[PDB]
């Protein structure tokens, strides 16, 4: 508990999550290491422990939107709204009641992201981050919205300034690698993927089945990125999951 809280401030999460309200913190942490399955399981445990928690519902909605589960995300958003297109009407009514709520704007952006209406999501996320420019997760969501909405100009104004806020965010390296692949910038994209893999491994180097499953996606992305730049030697070494030659 105390060790996890103290460690999480130094922009490292693998050690903190390995150490593990506790369910909520564990799940919110696991959402930041491309471990959406374990994060969702922990969030469900927290919700069955306490449905009233609003951060739990927000994290569940974010994870479900990341998982392309529209119904689960809508249900989580409705639960979050009730804890304090018809769901769209409820969100609009809540926004009209309190037009200065960063959580409301973040929820609107999340709702617009999985509805493929990226423009309104970008507007709401810019408004939300303007309200609170000290939250790394809000700039995280905004940068993800911009990247998924094509045209990854602004390498990033935050989310890579959320890096100045939270340097250890693995989802940073993931989205920067994706955006660099969008502009055919493969070398530094692979460098970012390797940095994310190293951050995931940490110092204790967990060897759990879930951790390996989660890192398999990033390893596959790295292998795909190496194919386009004919690096067969690195592809062959990638099968051993040895990041030392990559580093």
């Amino acid at each position: 508990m105390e060790e996890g809280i103290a460690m999480l401030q130094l922009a490292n999460m693998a050690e903190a999550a390995l150490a593990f309200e506790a369910w909520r913190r564990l799940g919110t942490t696991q959402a930041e290491n491309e471990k959406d399955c374990l994060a969702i399981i922990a969030l469900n445990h927290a919700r069955m422990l306490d449905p009233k928690d609003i951060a739990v519902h927000a994290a569940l909605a974010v994870s479900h939107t990341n998982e392309h589960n529209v119904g689960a995300a809508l249900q989580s958003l409705r639960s979050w709204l009730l804890s304090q297109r018809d769901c769209c009407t409820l969100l609009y009514a809540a926004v009209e009641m309190n037009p200065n709520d960063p959580q409301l704007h973040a929820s609107l952006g999340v709702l617009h992201n999985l509805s493929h209406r990226f423009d309104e999501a970008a507007k709401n996320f810019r408004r939300a981050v303007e309200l609170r420019p000290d939250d790394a997760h809000m700039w995280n969501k905004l940068g993800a919205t911009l990247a998924n909405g094509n045209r990854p100009q602004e390498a990033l104004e935050a989310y890579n300034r959320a890096l100045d806020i939270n340097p250890g965010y693995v989802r940073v390296m993931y989205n920067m690698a994706v955006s660099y692949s969008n502009m055919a910038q493969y070398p530094l994209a692979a460098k970012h993927i390797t940095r994310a893999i190293a951050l995931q491994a940490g110092g204790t180097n967990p060897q759990g089945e879930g951790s390996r499953i989660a890192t398999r996606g990033l390893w596959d992305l790295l292998r795909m990125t190496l194919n386009l730049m004919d690096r067969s030697d690195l592809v062959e070494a990638s099968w051993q999951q040895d990041l030392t030659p990559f580093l």
Partner: protein, 312 residues
Amino acid sequence: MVNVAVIGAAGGIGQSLSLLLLRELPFGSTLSLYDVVGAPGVAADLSHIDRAGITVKHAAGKLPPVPRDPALTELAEGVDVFVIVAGVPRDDLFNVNAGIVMDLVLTCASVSPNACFCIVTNPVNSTTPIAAQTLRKIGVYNKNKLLGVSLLDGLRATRFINNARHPLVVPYVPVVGGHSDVTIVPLYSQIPGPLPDESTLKEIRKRVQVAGTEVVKAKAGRGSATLSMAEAGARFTMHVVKALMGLDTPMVYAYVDTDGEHECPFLAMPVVLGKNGIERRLPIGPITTVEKEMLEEAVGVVKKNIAKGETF
């Protein structure tokens, strides 16, 4: 005795495609339909047409889409041909269509790995390689059993050359390259009869290349060409079905995977269909110098499209 599953049957293209396929499928076959919304209303619309010897199956959709839908898993059992026609009605048109194509192929190929996949979704240069990568991920992939429908280009080229050479009429026109604005190369040299003229055949080639924009502009930006695409998809599906039964060995032009052969991994080249998918991949053949320049220019764009599809 084939099962033909039309995925996305309640859309604009899918309804007409299902109506056309109901009247042409052989006696003793079944029609399988699926969509997220509106599939029951089409299934209990095509079941009132008499059509002795054909059964109509369907699977209902679900609440806002969930990955790996159980209804699709139930319906896609024992299916011989898959017709992937689903998507949203410029650049945002690719990612939304790619996600659902990945999901659909992942759901269908797990229960029926030895089936044929015909891709009718839109960014055709980009979704066929995506459908191949998601198949490779599962562990099953037959290069002879994955085809990209690009018959609309041939239909348009045949129509446009027949109008300029009446009463001389040809049944088909070879079209190679891709399925986009500048990647469509109509080979008017390889057809019988005297060609009209240069500086006039160029206009016809350009019209073939940018013919899709004309329909969109005519509709005041309210839709696309659904009847033509439905006709082309029905024709290609009928060709594949007839070839699988041993009742024909057609020669068709499809966006297939060039096994070796051309340096571009996913060019559109003439192929010969058979009981096991693709039997022979024919070479492009002799072309003139203008067609050579057009093909050389289009190959690079096709390579860029393949790379963009395979990265995501």
